[PDB]
């Protein structure tokens, strides 16, 4: 029952991941989450301000 | 055991066998350039080739998807670009690679120790912002460090940081960690392989011996 | 110190004029924004040749000009067509020469390098906003960027004050100098008010253009004979008396005047790059300019003036020294290149620049286009404003 399930596993590793998951219908999903540049941190700052 | 050369042919012909492949694509200079790899990373490679051949809109032509489908498991992720304002860095991080790769094709003139170069990047794709890869030579070449190999070798870990120097006209910090490799293989060099001339005929009176990986 | 042909023909010193900053912008295209300790270490050799390399942020090809010297070429074909300066025909040709090719993200990408101030003016004009409301659309940012300059003082390009007070109102006030050379010198400045009404109306960057388009017309009168008229301390006095009239330009003019060593011959830019003659150049240049960078029009005004007086009698060693000078290269070497032609004719020009010139991306029918708006430049007449 994966109707709707989702499972976000936080990596703070790209290049250590067990073998098994990462095939189709698994883990295979990757999302690198860069730091803000200065545009970015001046949003953050204004979305917090207001 | 872990597979390779000829079991890395079959594995990778095995998750190829319902794909198209050019012929452009070397199997060979791809099994021997991936050492050390199983089934349980050659069908990521194969499986994020075919995706990104799916996402350029095309059959599975050329190397380049190949290349990205090596680099997204060995060198993991893919990092922003280095950025266009300012020549800086775009200069650093192609000077160093060029000259790299330059001393390469040089030293595979004349001598001919130096393998060929595959592929630079300069796209940061995990850990690192710039890579010049080297087109790994059959294995036997490999068991055995020689003398014009090593220095051939003291030369391509100079090469990068003397391009950058070249480049901008001036010293850098590129040149650190090329200096701290070819430091350690110039100390190899004199003192354990004895391929110099220190005491007339290269034999010191000590040699730093290295130690096992198991401690 | 004088060249060769002490008479040159007004055929000759137009084409001059327009082929030296033609030479100047291909020249030093590629060192915009760049200091002139990063350009001497670049060039160990001296920047004597066009570079095919560019690997900045638009990269410049072999033998192109930015749009600086798009703008000069756009003014001097709109002035020899109108016969003196009338800012509808100058917009008109301006624009023509702008929109070109790009990409409309709409900022429409312009095919060659431009100033921010400028693409914003040439944006504003292309989107019905009238050319008479500077501050209406050019105080976007500028105001806000003088605001924003409350807790930094960088010398970063994004922080430089490009409004105006920019050097682009002197950049291409060297033709409007050389057609109104024997107009006398109120009519020329009113040409020069005319010319910048819809970009700079500041009197920062009046003056800057008055100065540069007095000393064109000055150099299209003298020819390069006896040191009676060929005298750089005669130019700036005649430019202080008759056309400095503000206080930052009269001081940097007189802090040109006192000083201005007359550089020797130079054959190994390697050796000259690390001496007391470049030395003392460069101390002056950063006296006259902050960290290199020429941005206010006074400033600009000033180092043109250094680069072209410095080397008083070599041309070509005058656009070399102002396209190493780095910071606003492009520019500045179109207008060092601008006055020397408008002292010496088509005969200094190196054929290694004709031939990078001749063979580059705008090349062959552009090197001749500018040839032949060189022509219609001296062959236009005038009448004392028409």
Not at chain 3, 125 to 135: E, M, N, S, W
Request: proline content about 5%.
């Amino acid at each position: 029952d994966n109707r709707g399930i989702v499972v976000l596993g936080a990596t703070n590793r790209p290049g250590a991941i067990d073998s098994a998951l990462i095939r189709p219908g698994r883990f295979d999903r990757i999302i690198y989450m860069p730091l803000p540049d200065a545009l970015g941190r001046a949003k953050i700052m204004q979305v917090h301000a207001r | 055991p872990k597979p390779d050369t000829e079991g890395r042919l079959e594995i990778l012909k095995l998750h190829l066998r319902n794909k198209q492949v050019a012929p452009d694509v070397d199997l060979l200079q791809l099994a021997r350039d991936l050492p050390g790899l199983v089934g349980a990373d050659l069908a990521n490679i194969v499986n994020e080739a075919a995706m990104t051949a799916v996402r350029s809109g095309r059959q599975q032509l050329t190397a380049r998807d190949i290349y990205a489908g090596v680099d997204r498991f060995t060198q993991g992720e893919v990092r922003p670009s280095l950025p266009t304002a300012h020549k800086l860095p775009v200069l650093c991080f192609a000077a160093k690679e060029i000259g790299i790769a330059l001393v390469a094709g040089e030293l595979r003139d004349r001598y001919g120790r130096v393998e060929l170069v595959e592929r630079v990047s300069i796209q940061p794709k995990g850990r690192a912002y710039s890579r010049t890869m080297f087109q790994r030579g059959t294995d036997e070449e490999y068991q055995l460090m020689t003398r014009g190999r090593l220095l051939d070798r003291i030369r391509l870990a100079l090469a990068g940081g003397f391009a950058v120097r070249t480049a901008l006209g001036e010293e850098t910090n590129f040149t650190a960690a090329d200096i701290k490799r070819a430091t350690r293989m110039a100390k190899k060099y004199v003192f354990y392989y004895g391929f110099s001339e220190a005491g007339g005929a290269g034999i010191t009176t000590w040699a730093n011996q290295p130690y096992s990986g198991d401690f | 110190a004088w060249r060769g042909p002490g008479e040159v023909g007004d055929e000759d010193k137009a084409v001059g004029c327009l082929l030296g900053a033609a030479v100047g912008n291909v020249l030093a295209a590629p060192y915009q924004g760049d200091r002139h300790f990063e350009v001497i270490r670049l060039r160990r050799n001296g920047v004597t040749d066009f570079w095919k390399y560019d690997i900045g942020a638009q990269p410049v090809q072999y033998g192109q000009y930015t749009g600086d010297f798009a703008n000069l070429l756009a003014v001097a074909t709109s002035l020899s067509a109108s016969r003196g300066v009338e800012p509808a025909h100058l917009l008109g040709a301006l624009t023509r020469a702008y929109a070109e090719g790009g990409s409309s993200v709409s900022g429409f990408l312009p095919a060659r390098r431009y100033s921010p101030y400028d693409r914003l003016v040439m944006d504003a004009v292309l989107a019905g906003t009238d050319p008479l409301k500077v501050p209406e659309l050019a105080e976007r940012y500028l105001a806000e960027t003088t605001r924003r300059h409350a807790s930094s003082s960088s010398d970063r390009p994004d922080r430089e004050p490009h409004g105006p007070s920019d050097l682009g109102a002197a950049a291409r006030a060297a033709p409007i100098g050389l057609a109104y050379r024997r107009a006398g010198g109120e009519r020329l400045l009113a040409a020069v008010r005319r010319s910048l009404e819809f970009s700079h109306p500041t009197p920062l960057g009046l003056d800057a253009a008055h100065v540069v388009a007095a000393a064109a017309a000055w150099c299209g009168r003298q020819q390069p004979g006896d040191a009676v008229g060929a005298t750089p301390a005669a130019l700036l006095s005649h430019l202080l008396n008759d056309v400095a009239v503000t206080a930052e330009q009269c001081g940097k003019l007189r802090l040109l005047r006192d000083n201005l060593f007359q550089l020797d011959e130079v054959t190994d830019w390697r050796a000259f790059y690390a001496g007391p003659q470049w030395a003392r150049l460069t101390a002056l240049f950063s006296r006259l300019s902050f960290h290199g960078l020429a941005t206010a029009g006074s400033e600009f005004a000033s180092v043109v003036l250094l680069a072209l007086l410095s080397s008083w009698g070599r041309p070509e060693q005058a656009v070399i020294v102002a396209a190493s000078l780095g910071g606003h290269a492009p520019a500045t070497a179109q207008t060092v290149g601008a006055l020397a032609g408008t002292l010496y004719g088509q005969s200094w020009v190196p054929e290694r620049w004709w031939r990078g010139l001749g063979e580059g991306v705008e090349g062959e029918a552009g090197r001749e286009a500018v040839v032949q708006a060189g022509r219609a430049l001296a062959a236009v007449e005038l009448a004392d404003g028409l």
